[PDB]
Symmetry: D2
Subunit: 257 residues, 4 copies
């Protein structure tokens, strides 16, 4: 396997993308801690065996969970920071302090705290001929805004520049740092995530491939960015969006018109 013998922590590991990443990592020979909220971990099953579940709460909690995870793995080669609150709130005019703080604190500051803890553990465990790997999960919303979700969109721009600042500062310490930017991803397991009629029409217009992605289609990039061969890739984004961010006036194309 392409990750044979590597120690990995995946946060948000109960959710769609996090879950698909745990499974792809186990399948490629890694030892994997799956970190998420206690209830969620309780309620999930993985199609691959070997996952070490560890409950956490995306500051004291984060440090405790990360220390425990590194203790059980005997080190740390790979961090996938997949923990994230999703969803919109309404127009920016009515955006409350509580909604702002929740998205910024959970998504931006939570990812910072997790990645600082991970990076320090990687250095302590001797990162660097080969390099440790930090992988953040951002969004096409790290670059272009959806309506009525200013707190989530701002946080994602924060995560994108955090990723680049981390790449720059951690290069000397033998750690490579990159982001994965998914477009729409159906996480229902049911093919019902984007089935609301107006939403399904706009997916057909705005995504070149005309559909949402599956979690497995994102996890594959997390393997690519964790493997030995990706040793000159740092500070970059792998965008996984079926052409969403590449296209304008996609509603006018042949086949849609």
């Amino acid at each position: 396997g392409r990750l044979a013998g590597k120690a990995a922590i995946v946060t948000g590991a109960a959710g769609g993308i996090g879950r698909a990443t745990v499974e792809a990592y186990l399948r490629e020979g890694a030892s994997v801690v799956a970190m998420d909220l206690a209830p969620r971990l309780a309620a999930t099953r993985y199609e691959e065996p070997g996952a070490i579940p560890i409950a956490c709460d995306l500051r004291a909690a984060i440090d405790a969970a990360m220390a425990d995870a590194v203790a059980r793995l005997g080190g740390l080669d790979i961090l996938v920071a997949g923990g994230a609150l999703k969803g919109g709130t309404g127009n920016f005019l009515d955006l409350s302090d509580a909604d702002w703080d929740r998205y910024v604190d959970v998504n931006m500051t939570g990812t910072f705290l997790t990645c600082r803890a991970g990076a320090r553990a990687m250095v302590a465990a001797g990162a660097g001929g080969r390099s440790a790997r930090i992988i953040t999960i951002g969004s096409v919303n790290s670059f272009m805004a959806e309506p009525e979700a200013a707190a989530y969109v701002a946080a994602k721009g924060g995560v994108a520049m955090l990723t680049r600042a981390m790449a720059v500062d951690l290069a000397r310490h033998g750690i490579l740092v990159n982001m994965i930017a998914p477009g729409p991803v159906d996480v229902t397991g049911n093919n019902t995530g984007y089935s609301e009629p107006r939403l399904a029409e706009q997916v057909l217009d705005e995504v070149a491939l005309g559909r949402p992605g599956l979690p497995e289609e994102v996890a594959t990039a997390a393997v690519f960015l964790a493997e030995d061969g990706s040793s000159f890739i740092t500070g970059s984004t792998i965008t996984i969006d079926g052409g969403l961010s590449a296209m304008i006036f996609g509603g006018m194309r042949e086949g849609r018109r």
Copy 2:
């Protein structure tokens, strides 16, 4: 003047860029509130007359109070320039403390959010759009909103936050007659002394990395704040004007003829 009769609030108005913007706005016929920390306002003079100083503190209670007072004194609000910002690095990301992280995110990202939400609500209350013309929000980000300097992860992250906040604001506020854009400065000498980038290793890297081979002046950034606030810029929203002497356009600038 190009801003004749418009009501403007400029935050960070004691600092270099904020100060140059207050002066350009007064020169172009606007009524201007200059907002900054009380001490700083006390210690500044403007080369143009008419500025209405109002002390503020980018808590949240403070921001609302200062904005309400500002709008009361202006009799409305057409233009907001959110220039308040903590600058500077801390050290390597490995040693970045919770306190430094929180301070940059809370002051630069959340402070800009709180100021812009207050501003936007005041603009709507004052009838933005009603005569066919649009109110204007202008945020000051940085080349660090797109590319990272070393040893400043908290500041760089916050600037990415401000860049996407700006685009989310543009999208949501278009229906309310408000246009929202960012100005992204590269290196800007704010000493008044031409000494801001004079440390020898730094001055060498400015010569290599900036195509024009020098730092900018605050006035060179203020000119874009006038452009983005004027009536003519009525189809410009969700965009960035980058003011960096070619920094973000160039790679291997140390190899160019004249440098090598």
Copy 3:
């Protein structure tokens, strides 16, 4: 006027954006050559007086001849706006012919290169930088310089070409006192008739994809050509000013309140 005493060439000067730029430049005190095809110049009127018409054809021989004549009549060159462009799509990439490819690349990419090389040489010959101020090259790209419309691969490719040409020119010409920037318009109605984007499916997609919910006017683009040509923009080079009503800032605009 903001361009008082400056010598400017505007190419594509019969067309919408080029015409609006000639008029804004005359209104701001510049001496202006209007360059375009002979027939088109014959068929156009400007709402401002003073334009020096000069026919051209974006041969290479033609471009040099026209530029030499223009510079002779102006007595120098401070400002070039390279607005000449073939627009329009062809069909799916699978069926894109050699003739359509060559025509879009040759006219839009190479024609902009030839015009800007001639302009830059003339600017240096006329002493660009000598008075501490810089000459200015302004290219007209598109949102298609960064994101692709369907069924227009030749036009889209050429626009990405022009975007990178612009940056390469910024880097190489900084030492010669010339600043180089691009303007990237989104949809612009050039009918004078409010009928450019009136086909019903198209009008629906403009409402969905443009935050301001309409096409721009030529005048809304020209305003940036003045900003980029004036003395105050002296630290701005290698950049893009995007004028698209939020098109490139937004995704899933069809879902927003007021549209769904």
Copy 4:
């Protein structure tokens, strides 16, 4: 192997990146045509067996002939890597000749267009999509697709062209079951000798501007060509994978701890 049973054409297959890609593709179970100039193919050896060499001249007649022959021998086409490219600078933009311009645009932009149009038509003819899996076009651009090096305006312009071509292809070919992406390498040492970036001023600027402080190896780029060609990458189209050791992510790298 991850490409087991797939038919691939790799152009520029004698050169560093193209060679490393042919080898990685053979190692992952693909049948591979290696396309390049006749002399170069004659002079190269691959560390893996199975390559089908086919001479070509990125010569429009030549391209079609070589591609028809390649598809005939493979019995179809699942994967195209368009790696053919002229590299190198010329001098300042002011002195850039028509002949250098045309050679870079014609070989790098137009040659990539002709190759990819041929490839895409073959892929459709061979039934791309029928089994629910998609054919794959991979273009080799550069960090110069986005930011300019000095003294290489023709090469840089062409790379911006190839970047936007890639996106226009992604958009138009999605309905035909083909995914299209670019790989953007930073500095890559293609000497086999660790001498590519050894000139002292250059080596110094690589240390300053690349976060990893070195050039890449061809193998470090080829790995992304495998990723983009495999079945798992089925939601990735219109994108860029940048492989540059942090070059495009960083500013003022010369100031970082360990360098200053």
